[PDB]
């Protein structure tokens, strides 16, 4: 029975599903983003006041790994939660028509900034667009960091490289990846606040994109 | 492209804007008419929007004169306007000739007014279909008429959302010259076949006329005996 | 596309420009009417834009004659123009026949003027709804009428922003043949249900008419006893 | 989209082209009117474009008859055309009935002319607001009227660029039944509150009328005593 | 967008198409008028397209009657048409009342014809400005009038390409009640200030009228004594 | 953008659609007129499309009456229509007053008809220029007139493709009051200057009128003596 | 309570938040950008008048690192401040409608040049667009420099390369990265001035993009 | 005070600032461009008439370095001066509106060919567009040259490569980079003349893009 | 004085400047292009009838260098002459307006095919568009050739590579680069003829893109 199937979809992902997510973003999530911002700024201060010798090519700083893993855990949750809102909207896009699409326009409008959050901000894809990656750092930031550092680590350990700048680059990899988290957290906060506002102002048309009788007809 | 003005033909020779008017007719309540032994009848469903509405008001079956009636479907304001044109047109004919010999001509006049609004830019068509049923000097008559100004004479027909349901049921079940009571029962039965089960048929309108008489509107109690 | 001219049907047979006119009506103050024992009444809320405004002026309840009144919602200039058409239309009928036997006909004339502006290009519809309430030879009447030219007769109804609030409350609470005093109380109660709590109902308008009498406009003190 | 023709509604039921006419009214000089003890007054500011202009010419306060006057704001050529319609309309009424019993009716006629231009394609609205003030058989009257044809009666109001300044000032400061002299002082004070300090108020226009008298235009010297 | 039809307001409440008409006026030859002791005068420059043109023909200063004259700038064919309206309008007034008591009214009639063409679709405005100067029962008068139908009374003013030059010069240099000869000199001096040096002023037109007299057109020799 | 309707101004205050009409005039055959001692003459070139055409037919120089003639250039059908308007306009004036005192007025009437078609939507301008030459009570006259309704009086001028060639040649060579024979020679010489050498001037049209006479059309033999 | 949530967002990032940023850009920031421009031009002069030998492949010039780190600190701040203005605007984008979008147009217009500042000028992303990086140098300039130099350092140190031009390239990397800061600072100044102007002219419609009564209706 | 802020921006970069630049471009700059053109054509002649042996892989010709550095100094100045004109325009782009944009159209029109000058002609970005680099050579020409030459220098010096063509390529790198300066200078001259014209014809609307009274209103 | 400045620009590059170029292209240039086409076809015949052994990896064929250098010299001139015509047009693009742009349209139309000639045909940029290089060979053909050949030369000389195909590839590099010149000359001829026609048909509007009186006004 076709209506039963649609009803099941919608009973499972209701407007209180997507609202749950938005309440959480307004409270918990924005606070946890700020904590990661402060963890990363602090790590960046330690690295700024450090002279790096070969000693530093021999262990990976656990303070930085912690800040990076912690941000990756946030991005993981924000994405899954985004995908709840997106499910709640996507399963209520009504029959295709060339008319009565005022609400459907609100629906595509809001799906568009959830797309931006997921793809462009949480940098969650295998590959970027030909628009690039405008976000400072991805979901796979931990792996970008370890990969970038280990190339520098090998050249420094081996006869290790005698390049003074290559040693300073090991430090700049550590500095920059902490800066990249501060920047990515600032920007993720804006995006989250923007989706909070875009949702709460548009939620009615997101659930019922078409209403109205046939009052004119009998 | 060819879709947006009443005066524009498509390359296949269609007037979509008129075809679109025809979709407005599908949004109305279902009504039907049929000929039986020495007469014709109409039955109409009705949206009852609320219990705060007044029942004995804005009727779907409307008398044009004592011997002719119409039911309509589609945009209600358009329908009202067309029914009053129908009534004034009827009285002009009576004043000119003293009587209405052939109902087909009243219908044509109404259909021509409708056709006119499918040809001159600056107006949209009436989003309305009508069934006219009455007795004239030919005999019992049953016509329908749509936004395009198209006319047909039937033994039985219907208009509204449930049209297709009701026309199939009748294609299978209709016979000519039934007695009034059986004709009305076939009609109620046909009408029910267009509902979506669960959904049940409240008090509908029923009017009937037989040769040598005036029209006769069934009251809600008389109607109830068939539910 | 199909959105931008009164003369254009959509492919589902809709007149969006008319539907849009209908949204204008939602921006008015809420008003309601209801029938009670041997009579009918109207109650209207009112935006009071400032304290520099003059209260005893531009009334939401307007007499059409001694036995018929209207409330309106939507574009105020349109509404003013329509009320004066209604008044002149009433007087034309009285001069022709010596009286106004059936209010439904006045309403239809106003509704036809409105329908006309949903069919000929070069005009937009009136962004107005009206409720008409009065006594005629049928009895107490209550009608509404929208930008499409659609008409219904009610026991109770409403128009304006708080329409849906007020119609639910009445779907649950309304009984026929209440005494005047209780009908007015039910009305004030229904009106309050459409406000957003915190927000409180200032002095609204109340007019009433009973069989064999002329209309009677409640003064602000009399109205106060119900607040 | 919904922005570009007087005959088009927006999906929210708005007439933007009329809303835009209303912005033309903000570009005019500020003027205000107010009721006081047995009378009403008008005060108007004035752009003095140069010292090569002639002062005793094209007045912002215009008499409609001996007992009614108007100030206007917005497109000047439109305003002129509307003031002359107002005068001719006033004389038609006096010839028909011998007098002008209620000024509200003059205003409505002017408001209707304006409303009409917000409905038929092929014309744009008048980009003008007016304040009418006078004495009639009800008493001292003060009305405004905008491009949409909307009317309100006030105790005090204003039109022009400084409107919002002047209306706030009056919302705080106005009292009813002031003597003429204090009323005029309150008015000048209110007008000043709308200027941008540094900027100083040159000679404005002041007219007043009290029950049982004709209008009285203050000359520049009399006006000066208040600056 | 808001740029392309006389009937469209911009969202800031402007009529660009009218503003554009006003640019057509900047392409005309410069002319000016000024009031002096018991009189008023006009002076006009002139494009002399060639030496194959006929000088004593198509004059920039045009008499409307014996006591009123006009200079125009902008589209010449529009200006011609407006001047003849002005003349016929003047004679209608004289036939109705026997004389032209107040020139402001002639000007208003012309200005109204112009305003009308800024409001109904299907026409474009007149791309013309005019100065009217004459004697009436009030005294010596000097008016200007533009494509919008806007009117002002001046002591001195100008129209055409060199307008801004000429108005500045006069803002600095004009005094009231000069004798005729000095007034004409001031005018020629002003006119020259608008030319681009190198470029020199050929024979311009000069007309003048004083209280109790008819107009007087200076011939090219009399004009020469001022060059 | 601003290019596509006669009723639209460009932001610089131009009517491009009229300027384009003016380009139609450049496609015509070259013709010229000039004043000489006590008279005026016209000379016109002519496309001779084939040898199967009839020479003594459709003449480029057309008499309006015995004392006034016209040559035209541009769209031929528009020109024909305007010459007939010219002739009828002439006879109206003669019937009203008994004679045609000033040819400038005939021209203005023709010019006004043309101007009118540059201001109301739903018509395009006439793509025509004309030269009118005749004798009236002022003396010998020579005017031109273009699609915009612009008018000038000349001593000599020209219209058509070779206009600019012929006007330069005349700017250098023309003198006033030549005897007829020398005037005609100067004209033929001027005309030749506009051809592209190799290309040679076949038999052109020549008409002339002197004070106290009627027009006089040169026959092809008389014309030949100047080739 | 949905309005309370929106109100919280807006009480936190007010117009005086975004104004605070614009005042700072008009005074402090443009001065600091000019100081960095002078620091970089001066460093470029020292390098221009230098003959480079292998001695120069053996240490990384601290003068250049100082100029680069100082620019990266500026870019970091300008980006975080940009994101404040962008939060102030983004949380006041109203209900989606196909009408009354005159102020929303101003909002998207101003967000567009904040985008250009952040992405295109502060070159703050992982990847560029297919439009490229029109900006002379990024936020990660220090790392682009150390990376470019250390490749040349290795080839020169090792048998070190005997290429005369490779030696001159080490000098040009030092020169060009200083030039790149002069150029990027010039251009960042224009961008900052441009947003100062765009903001102060449009700020009212950025906060209240829709106003007006229903005066026509009762 | 918001008007004070705007006023300060504008007082600082006036029309005489931008005019100063255009006068300089009409006189000094076009002459210096032509001198670089001649320096480069002459250096190209010297290289054309030269047979290259391994001797040439052992020093970097200072004549070519001089021509290149000299062009880079010109491009540096032309860019900074372009950015002055651009600041003068950008800080006078008025309040966003959907009307009265005739001057704003001139403003965006002239900012567009300044963009072409800076980005496309002076090739001043980290990365090119997906339209490419139509300009024959960039701001970072000196570095493109030294880098391209030092690859060939290594292969030739080392057993050095025995490829006869690789030797001829060292000569072509020297020839081409001088040709590239001649071409780039030709093209830059057109662009500079084009902006001189575009500015002087449009300058009034660039400063006051909206004028006019409310004559129609009172 | 602003008009003086414009007048100087235009007095220097007049229509006879641009006409001079077109006369030359009609006569001299199209002949010289055909000579290069024949030189290259002939060189291609020699290579076609040749068996290549290691002897051929040991010298660079001077016949091919001569054809290539000769083509590069033509492209150099055609580009500098194109830029003359472009200067003559560009300095007469009039005041920006939203009207009277019929001539300006001709101006942009003709500038467009001069762009096609310079960029797309003479392949004169550092980088191609994302449309590619439709032209068979660039201005830097000589360098593309030597570079392609010297890679194959090294692999063949060194133990030199034993790949039979690698030896045949050295021959195909020689063949193909001569084919590429034939093809590029064919195509350059069309482009030159096309600009000859486009100029001579449109030259009046190129110089005076706006004319006309104010005959309607006085």
UniProtKB/TrEMBL annotation, chains A, G, H, I:
Question: Is Electron transport found in the keyword set?
Answer: no
State the Gene3D superfamilies in the record: Proteasome activator pa28, C-terminal domain
GO cellular component: a single term: proteasome activator complex
Question: Proteasome activator PA28 C-terminal domain location, by residue?
Answer: 60-120
- Give the GO biological process terms: proteolysis; regulation of proteasomal protein catabolic process
Which Pfam families does the record associate with it? PA28_C
Question: What InterPro entries does its record include?
Answer: PA28_C, PA28_C_sf, Proteasome_activ_sf
Q: Which UniProt keywords apply?
A: Proteasome
Give the protein's recorded name.
Proteasome activator protein PA26
Q: Which organism is it from?
A: Trypanosoma brucei
């Amino acid at each position: 029975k076709r209506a039963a199937l649609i009803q099941n979809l919608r009973d499972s992902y209701t407007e209180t599903s997507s609202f749950a997510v938005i309440e959480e973003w307004a409270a918990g999530t924005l606070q946890e983003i700020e904590g990661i911002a402060k963890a990363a700024a602090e790590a960046h201060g330690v690295i700024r006041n450090s002279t790096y010798g070969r000693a530093q090519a021999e262990k990976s700083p656990e303070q930085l790994l912690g800040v990076l893993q912690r941000y990756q855990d946030l991005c993981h949750n924000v994405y899954c939660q985004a995908e709840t809102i997106r499910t709640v909207i996507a399963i209520r896009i009504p029959e295709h028509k060339e008319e009565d699409n005022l609400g459907v326009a609100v629906q595509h409008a809001v799906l568009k900034i959830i797309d931006e959050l997921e793809i462009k901000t949480l940098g969650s894809g295998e590959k970027s667009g030909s628009g690039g990656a405008p976000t400072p750092i991805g979901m796979y930031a931990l792996r970008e960091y370890l990969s970038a550092r280990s190339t520098v680590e090998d050249k420094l350990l081996g006869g290790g490289s005698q390049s003074p700048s290559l040693l300073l680059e090991l430090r700049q990899i550590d500095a920059d990846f902490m800066l990249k988290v501060e920047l990515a957290t600032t920007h993720l906060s804006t995006m989250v606040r923007a989706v909070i506002n875009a949702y709460l102002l548009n939620w009615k048309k997101l659930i019922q994109p078409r209403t109205g009788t046939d009052h004119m007809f009998s | 492209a060819y879709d947006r003005a009443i005066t524009v033909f498509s390359p296949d020779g269609r007037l979509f804007q008129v075809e679109y008017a025809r979709e407005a007719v599908k949004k109305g309540s279902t009504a039907l008419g049929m000929k039986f032994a020495n007469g014709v009848l109409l039955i109409s469903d009705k949206k009852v929007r609320s219990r705060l509405i007044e029942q004995n008001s804005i009727e779907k079956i409307q008398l044009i004169d004592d011997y002719v009636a119409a039911v309509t479907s589609g945009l209600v304001a358009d329908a009202r306007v067309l029914v009053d044109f129908a009534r004034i047109s009827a009285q002009q004919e009576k004043v000119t000739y003293g009587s209405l010999v052939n109902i087909e001509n009243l219908v044509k006049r109404v259909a021509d007014q409708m056709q006119q609004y499918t040809q001159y830019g600056g107006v949209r068509p009436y989003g309305v279909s009508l069934i006219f049923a009455g007795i004239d000097q030919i005999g019992p008559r049953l016509f329908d008429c749509d936004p395009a100004g198209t006319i047909n004479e039937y033994k039985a027909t219907a208009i509204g959302s449930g049209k297709d349901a009701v026309v199939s049921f009748l294609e299978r079940e209709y016979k000519e010259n039934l007695p009034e009571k059986e004709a009305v029962t076939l009609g109620i039965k046909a009408l029910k076949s267009s509902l979506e089960e669960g959904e049940e048929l409240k008090a509908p309108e029923i009017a009937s006329i037989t040769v040598g008489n005036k029209y006769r509107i069934y009251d809600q109690e008389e109607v109830k005996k068939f539910l």
